[PDB]
Design a protein around this ligand. Structure first.
Ligand SMILES: N#CCC(=O)Nc1cccc(C(F)(F)F)c1
Lengths: 300, 237
């Protein structure tokens, strides 16, 4: 189990840690989060009490270093930093644990939610989508745009998701125009899986990361990416059977975790109705279709 | 974006553009089988690709053999149209290629856009106009060449005959759409109007009769009357 120490909490803020969240009052004696499960990526995220505008946060993996949070009063945000002095950090964390100034990562033992949402998500791939190579953790916020959004404007601050565009020469083989547009298997299996992602794990990991950025930060371009990657699979007639079964589990847990009140903005009616009721895979997503029909029958 | 009454004069500026109508691409007769089921028999069709400024009509005849062994023909017909339009553009010298293609039915947008990915600078546009190009097969010489075709074939026409010698392309297009709207609303009556007088003939190299300017005014008035009538006969007014 690992720990993320806070120098202090000078401004009132709602702090999220993965799917959990808690309020910290201005200058409350809060010194961080303990008992964070090793083995998973995590995200620690922030929404200031005074400006709900810009949710922002940091993807990290405690196996990759010792990280902490210090508020910066000039830039006006909680910043993640890395402590290279391991003896400093152990000494600083042990003091705050002894004074019980930390919240405990509150995982129920039965509960596989976070594993199920991050199964294929790796820090190394996050760091290629979110380019800031001097840090081991990755900052994301509500406003960051994607490479593809910028094509249709600061490149350093972009989400470099894999560009998917169903009406593009990458997606459509000359002479197979109608075939490739109505059945995207070529684009999924040859262009994206074999060519770009290399395997379905990396594909699922980017899909999961896009979903999480959409849910935790309201990142609109991430939501676009999540839906595009779903639609690319559902609109393919030929998909490995293990991919479909895993997709069904992935989406099931995403829909399960989505706040009931955010469904109106985080879920694209057209994509979901096409994927569940019209697409080649309309009958291959049983768990997802059942939870969607019982939790969001309005969308459908 | 979409073409409508507001931006109607754009059709007659000097940016090359084509209308594409796919209505007559996939044509069938519906009939009973011996067993008393229903079946279709395809007949020859055509893509109607028209330069509204010049009158040049690129009539790509669609021979029934292209449907042999195919499924979902109404969907294929859209993609076949887009394939043939894209092949037409590629066949034209660069300075003759259109800068816009306007499709008369929205279901042609995605097939044409995908076939024209190689031409990112050609705008593929819908229209809100209700253009009567489906009635092209009421023009006897166009119907004749479509029905006689034994193989795929492109035939070039000028749908305005020699009208542009005497009138503008706005006026020629308005005449054409009035003639075609009439032929679509009541073909027999429209054709009676156009041919009632045997002294006015159709030149071998033309589609429509050789009306004088005054006779066109009479003809045009008769077509409006026909369209208004049928609109009464239809709604009882
Ligand atoms: N001095 C100094 C800078 C510095 O590195 N301070 C620091 C390092 C590691 C953890 C912590 C925390 F627990 F207080 F948050 C603070």
């Amino acid at each position: 189990m690992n720990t993320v120490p806070f120098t202090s909490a000078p401004i009132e803020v709602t702090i999220g840690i993965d799917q959990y969240s808690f309020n910290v009052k201005e200058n409350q004696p809060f010194h961080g989060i303990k008992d964070i499960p090793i083995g998973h990526v995590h995200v620690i995220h922030f929404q200031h009490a005074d400006n709900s505008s810009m949710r922002y946060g940091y993807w990290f993996d405690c196996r990759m270093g010792n990280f902490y949070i210090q508020y910066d009063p000039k830039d006006g945000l909680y910043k993640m930093m890395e402590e290279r002095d391991g003896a400093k950090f152990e000494n600083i964390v042990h003091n705050f644990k002894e004074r019980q100034m930390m919240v405990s990562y509150p995982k129920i033992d039965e509960d596989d939610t976070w594993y199920n949402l991050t199964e294929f998500v790796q820090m190394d791939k996050i760091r290629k989508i979110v380019r800031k190579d001097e840090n081991q953790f990755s900052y994301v916020d509500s406003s960051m745009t994607t490479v593809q959004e910028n094509e249709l404007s600061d490149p350093a601050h972009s989400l470099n998701y894999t560009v998917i565009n169903f009406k593009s020469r990458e997606a459509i083989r000359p002479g197979h125009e109608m075939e490739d547009f109505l059945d995207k298997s070529y684009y999924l299996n040859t262009v994206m899986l074999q060519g770009i992602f290399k395997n379905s794990s990396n594909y699922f990991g980017e899909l999961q990361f896009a979903f999480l950025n959409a849910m935790f930060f309201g990142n609109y371009g991430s939501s676009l990416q999540w839906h595009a990657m779903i639609e690319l699979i559902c609109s393919s007639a030929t998909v490995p059977k293990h991919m479909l079964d895993k997709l069904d589990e992935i989406l099931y847990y995403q829909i399960k975790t989505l706040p009931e009140q955010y469904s109106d903005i985080l879920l694209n009616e057209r994509v979901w109705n096409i994927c569940l009721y019209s697409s080649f895979q309309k009958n291959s997503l049983h768990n997802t279709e059942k939870i969607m029909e019982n939790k969001y029958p309005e969308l459908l | 974006g979409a073409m409508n009454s507001s931006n109607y004069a754009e059709l007659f500026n000097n940016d090359i553009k084509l209308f594409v109508d796919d209505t007559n691409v996939y044509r069938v007769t519906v009939h009973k089988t011996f067993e008393g089921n229903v079946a279709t028999k395809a007949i020859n069709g055509c893509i109607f690709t028209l330069n509204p400024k010049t009158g040049h009509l690129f009539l790509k005849i669609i021979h029934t053999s292209v449907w042999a062994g195919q499924k979902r023909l109404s969907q294929l017909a859209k993609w076949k149209t887009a394939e043939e339009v894209s092949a037409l553009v590629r066949s034209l010298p660069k300075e003759e290629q259109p800068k816009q293609i306007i499709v008369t039915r929205k279901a042609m947008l995605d097939p044409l856009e995908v076939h024209m990915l190689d031409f990112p600078n050609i705008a593929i546009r819908p229209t809100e106009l209700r253009l009567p190009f489906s009635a092209a097969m009421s023009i006897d010489k166009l119907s004749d060449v479509v029905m006689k075709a034994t193989e795929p074939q492109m035939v070039l026409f000028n749908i305005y005959d020699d009208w542009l010698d005497r009138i503008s392309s706005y006026t020629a297009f308005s005449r054409l759409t009035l003639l075609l709207r009439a032929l679509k609303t009541n073909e027999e009556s429209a054709k009676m109007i156009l041919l009632s007088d045997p002294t006015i003939t159709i030149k071998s190299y033309h589609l429509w009769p050789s009306f004088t300017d005054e006779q066109w005014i009479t003809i045009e008035s008769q077509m409006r009357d026909l369209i208004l009538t049928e609109y009464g006969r239809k709604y009882n007014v």
